[PDB]
Amino acid sequence: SVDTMALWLGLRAVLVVAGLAVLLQLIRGWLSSKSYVFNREEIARLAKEHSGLDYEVAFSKIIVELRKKHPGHILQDEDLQWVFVNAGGWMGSMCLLHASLTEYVLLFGTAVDTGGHSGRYWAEISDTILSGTFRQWKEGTTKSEIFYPGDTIVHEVGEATSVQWSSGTWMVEYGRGFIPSTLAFALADTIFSTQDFLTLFYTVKVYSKALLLEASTHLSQLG
Amino acid sequence: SVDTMALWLGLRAVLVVAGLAVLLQLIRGWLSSKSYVFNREEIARLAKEHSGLDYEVAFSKIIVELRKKHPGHILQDEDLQWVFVNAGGWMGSMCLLHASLTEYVLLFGTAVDTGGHSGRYWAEISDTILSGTFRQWKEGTTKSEIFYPGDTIVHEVGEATSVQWSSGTWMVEYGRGFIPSTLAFALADTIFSTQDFLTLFYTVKVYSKALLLEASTHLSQLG
Amino acid sequence: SVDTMALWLGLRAVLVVAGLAVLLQLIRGWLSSKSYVFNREEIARLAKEHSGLDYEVAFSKIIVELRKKHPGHILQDEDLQWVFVNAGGWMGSMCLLHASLTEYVLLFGTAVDTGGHSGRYWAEISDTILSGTFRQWKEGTTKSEIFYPGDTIVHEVGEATSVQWSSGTWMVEYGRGFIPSTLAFALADTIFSTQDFLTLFYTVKVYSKALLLEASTHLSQLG
């Protein structure tokens, strides 16, 4: 009975600590900046237009269109790089195109069968498929849904689903909200599982280059 | 030769530390309380009896029968909730019905293909399959075994196995032993991989509510 | 406006830390000990020659041939053991035959579908397949390659790939380079995921036994 009481008190302590953590995450999301360069419908339409072609040609055409419609906000050909992404038990790769304090645009996908935790969304993310399949298992339900090239899955803030991607699945991803908070989730398995310090290097490098591009465009627009 | 000696000394240090950890686990397990409300054969027969129905109807009927045969030991309908479980590389979901210092009962399953480490804890676990398949690859062997609805896999005290569950696999799980020791493994991937503080919140909340129900039943029986 | 610069400076700090980590990995792996007992071609042909038999008979004959051609460098039958290996999100099992500061030989494989990160280390790794399939997804590309019994996959120094093995895949693995640099990747999931301290016990025990056997052989050869 004494051990039961001690265990209940410890569980209550962990309960309130986790509640405070989630509350601080929600506060950071609420008080976040809302100056947006893109709209999610725009990225969704642009990615859905080229979903019928090969995914590499689609990547090329979408990058060209993004550079054409938003000059100074997309990285150059010299800065584009495929970087592994290990998070929540799954493994994929990304190619960052745009990333600021409130938005980011990248090409995400995997060439192998993988799946795991989607991560607690404290920012709004949208994925429009170009090839492969995307199986989502939302929280609270016992059934999953399948998504195909042309579909767009939007992840609201606070949602946590079970994601799964077949081999050769590739999509375009646009994130809106408090972008830095996602970094942790993007690097968790890189820190405590894969020990891939070079992947962490490449990730922070491309993010810093995207921030530098955004600041340079800001200065050139006001200067 | 010097580096080899240093590496061997470090390996011996890790060896003795891990041995002391295993010794602490076994000591806190053997000397744990053994006040049992249920027995694994009761839950096994209750789950196998309704294993032919749809897994949702089976869940409902099993919950009703548990509340009929053990009234003050099953959580209320207002306290039932599906909570994600990320551990050992695999991801699923649970709904807890009973949980004490020495026992716990829940409904566990996944709607997607998953698998990984079963985990090591001082607790005899029993899983009776309601739907789906369960592949178990025990330690020390090079071949696995498949289990179908109606079967009951018994994870013994020294269980190091590889588990795998196909999409739509649902089962009823009963565990007796040092239940808090099973918390760590159940939350490790939640801490270092998923960054899901809300799932940790839900887990500790439902465990605290189950312990509260058990303590309330105990006090109402002794008073 | 200002927080962009703040985040960029933080990313620069993380960048220099990760860069120093990678540079130290390179410098320590380079300029290391060059005492080699085996070579990847010998092990590759020894495994490919027996790749047509059942994998257990192949294991036995390969161990016998290794003890015949390199006596004193292979563990005894009393020291052989199958130990689970959780790393990078995948779960397999190993049987260590030889391990020193510069080389290691073991029998690896899995009885369940698994996959994940291969890991980065200054160590040339070669795997010759006896059964099952090995899908490798190298870094920087969007397509993977399948390998079959008889094939030998070379994990180059400093490379990072996505590995995937079907159920029943078994292979003979030979590592050359700075072996301790892999140890971290070999145990991360054991510490932050499986919490399996007995598997860690077994791993460090077999590594210490291999190092002790190597030291004994060296002393007997010079004494």
Numbering used by the authors:
A (entry chain C), B (entry chain A), C (entry chain B): -3 to 219
Quote what the paper states about this structure:
The sigma-1 receptor (σ1R) is an endoplasmic reticulum (ER)-localized, non-opioid transmembrane receptor implicated in many pathological conditions, including neurodegenerative disorders and cancer. So far, all reported σ1R structures are homotrimers, with the ligand binding site located inside the β-barrel domain of each σ1R monomer. The ligand binding site is located in the lumen of the β-barrel domain (β1-β10), whose opening is covered by two membrane-adjacent helices (α4/α5) at the carboxy-terminus.
Interestingly, in addition to the α4/α5-entrance and the hinge-entrance, the simulations revealed a third potential entrance located between the α4 helix (near S177 and F181) and the β4/β5 loop near R116 (termed side-entrance). The xlσ1Rside-open structure was solved in the C2 space group, with six protomers (two trimers) in each asymmetric unit. Among them, two protomers (A and B) are in a side-closed conformation similar to xlσ1Runknown-lig/xlσ1Rprog-co. Solvent accessibility analysis of the side-open protomer (e.g. protomer C) showed a clear opening surrounded by residues 114-118 (β4/β5 loop) and 177-181 (α4). Comparison of the side-open and the side-closed conformations revealed that a local conformational rearrangement of Y117 and W118 on the β4/β5 loop leads to open or close of the side-entrance. In xlσ1Rside-open, W118 of a side-open protomer (e.g. protomer C) is 4–5  Å away from Q191 and F193 (α4/α5 loop) of protomer A. Moreover, the side-entrance gives solvent immediate access to residues such as S114 (β4/β5 loop), Y117 (β4/β5 loop), D123 (β5) and H151 (β8), which are the coordinating residues for water molecules in the distal β-barrel lumen in the xlσ1Rprog-co structure. This data suggests that the side-entrance may be a potential water entrance that allows water to reach the distal region of the β-barrel lumen.
